[PDB]
Structure 1
């Protein structure tokens, strides 16, 4: 299971590398609209001998055929992408950081100064890798501008 998780993490690195070498958009290949053919010959209902209530059921099976053929064309993309990344997953780095667990020796105990620096590693990944520097006004400067308005009488 540790090797399956290192294989999956190496696979998801191979997916990210060969999708950033091709510079493709993120949502493009998960969108099945992008695998749809808009230049299909679009069957005309006036040449298919439909009766009165039969035309909307003709329209549904032209749509759901052309939608199933776009989903099944998305599956053929990802099944060919998988073998492209599984080939590069076999030649990969596998230098991942380990899960922070508290250090426990064989007959020893666990210090709270190590349970807490482990909890610091969990709450240091709760911060986002790129964030807005949304400023809180501290009370050290929100009072130095409040009483400056209160010395003028506002």
Structure 2
């Protein structure tokens, strides 16, 4: 609030320098229209994706756009030497992955064009941001700020939620009291807890405030147990695969798994002799 003290006089009678408009209402209106065009664009994206009945993660997954029926270059044809085969493999993997990523980018460019076409022809009625009501000379009441915070906290409630039942204190003490009435006073903890947990296991799903029926969801715990089971069985298949080859010929254990591609070449005579004589010498056995 502090100001410098000029302490000088004005010796000329001139008109005051009227500064020009300095556009902020125009720029903020352009920002608001850009935000609402982005909201219309996201609505058009969701409308096109809902009309095509397509998966959500599929179009963002680049593995969707990989060819997988593409003729893969044979490394025996391409005249590579001993240390060259892993770099050839990495080059083929790079070009296939970048082709998948570029195909995803081409898809999203076409989707952006169609979504902007659908976005231009949509009249927008979006709810405005809940701000406290402030008139030009008036003050701001606390009740209005509290209703605005109520709107902010109503946004915190999820649209579809598990009705996770908390056992109320009256119901807990009533069943706890009944356990005492029977006379088993020290297992009242476990009987009220098992009533709460039995209500929690069959927890119900609500539409908004009303209940959706015939709704079955897969939990993150159930999905992770499915992933762990499938992962353990595929690891079991890998262990069985290497167990067969090391039962027939255990000398494969002297070549480490990461170095193996560094041995290969296009022709068999060009394969690196770093491990050849040692492998054939281990293959005779312990004598």
Normalised to the residue count of structure 1, the TM-score between the two structures is: 0.99
In structure 1, runs of 5+ residues without a counterpart are none
**C-alpha distance in 2 between matches for 1:87 and 1:110:** 43
**C-alpha distance in 1 between matches for 2:123 and 2:45:** 14
Deviation at 1:93, TM superposition (A): 2.3
**C-alpha distance in 2 between matches for 1:140 and 1:9:** 47
The aligned counterpart of 1:66 is 96
**C-alpha distance in 2 between matches for 1:114 and 1:130:** 28
Deviations 1:41-60 (A, max 9, x none): 00000000000000000000
Secondary structure in 1 matching 2:63:
coil
Using CA pairs below 8 Å that are at least 6 residues apart, which structure has the higher relative contact order? 1
Secondary structure in 2 matching 1:137:
coil
Deviation at 1:153, TM superposition (A): 1.0
How many positions carry a matched residue from both structures?
154
For the pair shown, the structure with the greater C-alpha radius of gyration is 2
**C-alpha distance in 2 between matches for 1:113 and 1:41:** 70
**C-alpha distance in 1 between matches for 2:159 and 2:122:** 24
Secondary structure in 1 matching 2:178:
helix
Deviation at 1:140, TM superposition (A): 1.0
Deviation at 1:73, TM superposition (A): 0.3
The alignment's C-alpha RMSD in Å is: 0.4
Deviations 1:96-117 (A, max 9, x none): 0000000000000000000000
Normalised to the residue count of structure 2, the TM-score between the two structures is: 0.53
**C-alpha distance in 1 between matches for 2:123 and 2:176:** 57
